[PDB]
Design a binder for these strands. Structure first.
Lengths: 59, 59
RNA sequence: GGGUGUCGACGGAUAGACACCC
RNA sequence: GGGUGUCGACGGAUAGACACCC
């Protein structure tokens, strides 16, 4: 676990091919943008488990 | 860019070896937790540019 | 046009949808 | 004990630090 703090409108990074941007917040919601090549996957934690379980939307 | 929305206390995922967690907010700050192996790097956008420019802090 | 909260979404979009207030 | 804003940090920690108000 590595915690960081970020004001809305700033950015964060992962690996050498991924970037993240805190687009903003509302109440307790947070718009979080991600920038990665389709060479890698990105999903919510409630969806990531499904890409690993047998799929339901291949195409 | 792939935007997502998350209430504080929930999570998101990247690749097959990284996880993210919206630990919370404060004013306009956002505590963001990250969980990845030391086999890969993770930093702020104001620090990532430095791991790509030069350093001496590593082992 | 602005503010606030909530929602929906394997969505790759600096994205949307709804309600309330000015 | 509670609320709010800000700060610091290549830090791998559900992490810290400060100020204001009750």
């Amino acid at each position: 676990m590595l915690i960081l703090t970020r004001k809305v409108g700033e950015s964060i990074n992962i690996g050498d091919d991924i970037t993240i941007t805190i687009l903003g917040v509302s109440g307790q919601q947070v718009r979080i943008g991600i920038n990665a090549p389709k060479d890698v996957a990105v999903h919510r934690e409630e969806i990531y488990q499904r890409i690993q379980a047998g799929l339901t939307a291949p195409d």
